[PDB]
Ligand binder design. Structure first.
Ligand SMILES: CN(C(=O)c1c(F)cccc1Cl)c1ccc(-c2cc(C(N)=O)ccc2Cl)cc1OCC(F)(F)F
Length: 217
C-alpha cells in the first residue's frame, strides 16, 4: 500500500457510501425544525405493534438493501467468494444500519427522523421495546456528539463490515488484507482531517455488537 493507493481507497469508500446512503444528510438536517405534533405522535402510539412492525420492517429491508450496495461497491469486496460476502453482511449489515441511524438523530432535542418528520422515542410505544429504543437513542447520541462526519461514517462502517474475525469465513487471509487496507485509510484520513481525536471516543466493539444482538432478537 502506497499513498495514492490508500488515498484512493479513502475516496472510493467515501464515494461508495455517498451513493448508497439512502437518505441525504441535506434533507435530514433541513427537516429538524419540522417535528411531529402531539396529534401525530398519539397516532403512531395508537397503532398496533403489528402495524408498526411491518412499517419499520419496510424501512429496515430498504436500509439493508443500501448496506449491501455499499458493501458491493467496497474495493475487493466483490472479489471474495459468495460464501464470505454472506458471512460479512449477515454479521455486520445490522450493526452498520444502527451506526447509520446516528445521522437522523438530533441531540439538541433528543428526536430522530421517522417517516418524513422528527419524533421522540415515545413515537415507538406500540412496539413495547422501551429498553431497546432507549439504548438506540443513547448509542446514536454519543456518536452525534462527536459530530461524526459522512466520511468518518463511511470509513467506520466499512470496518464494521470487513472483519477477519467473523467465523464462517473460508478465505480469512483476503479479508484480513481488505480489513487492514481500510484501517490504513481510516487512520490516514483521520490524520488528514485532524480527527485523530475521535478514536479513543468511539463506542467499543463490545457495545455495538451487544446492542445489535438485542436488536436482532
Ligand atoms: C424502530 N426501528 C427499529 O429498527 C426497531 C427497534 F429499534 C426496536 C423494535 C422493532 C423495530 Cl422494527 C426502526 C426501523 C426502521 C427505521 C427506519 C426508518 C426510516 C424512515 N425514513 O422513517 C428509514 C430507514 C430506517 Cl432503518 C428506524 C427505526 O427506529 C428508529 C429508532 F431510532 F427509534 F430506533
Amino acid at each position: 500500500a502506497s499513498l495514492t493507493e490508500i488515498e484512493h481507497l479513502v475516496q472510493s469508500v467515501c464515494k461508495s457510501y455517498r451513493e448508497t446512503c439512502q437518505l441525504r444528510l441535506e434533507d435530514l438536517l433541513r427537516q429538524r425544525s419540522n417535528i411531529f405534533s402531539r396529534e401525530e405522535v398519539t397516532g403512531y402510539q395508537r397503532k398496533s405493534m403489528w402495524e408498526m412492525w411491518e412499517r419499520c420492517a419496510h424501512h429496515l429491508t430498504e436500509a439493508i438493501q443500501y448496506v449491501v450496495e455499499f458493501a458491493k461497491r467496497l474495493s475487493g469486496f466483490m472479489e471474495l467468494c459468495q460464501n464470505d460476502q454472506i458471512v460479512l453482511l449477515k454479521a455486520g449489515a445490522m450493526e452498520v444500519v444502527l451506526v447509520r441511524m446516528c445521522r437522523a438523530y438530533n441531540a439538541d432535542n433528543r428526536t430522530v427522523f421517522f417517516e418524513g418528520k422528527y419524533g421522540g422515542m415515545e413515537l415507538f410505544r406500540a412496539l413495547g421495546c422501551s429498553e431497546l429504543i432507549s439504548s438506540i437513542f443513547d448509542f446514536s447520541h454519543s456518536l452525534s456528539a462527536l459530530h461524526f462526519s459522512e466520511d468518518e461514517i463511511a470509513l467506520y462502517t466499512a470496518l464494521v463490515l470487513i472483519n477477519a474475525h467473523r467465523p464462517g469465513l473460508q478465505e480469512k487471509r483476503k479479508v484480513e488484507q481488505l480489513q487492514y487496507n481500510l484501517e490504513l485509510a481510516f487512520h490516514h484520513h483521520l490524520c488528514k482531517t485532524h480527527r485523530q481525536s475521535i478514536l479513543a471516543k468511539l463506542p467499543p466493539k463490545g457495545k455495538l455488537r451487544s446492542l445489535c444482538s438485542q436488536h436482532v432478537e
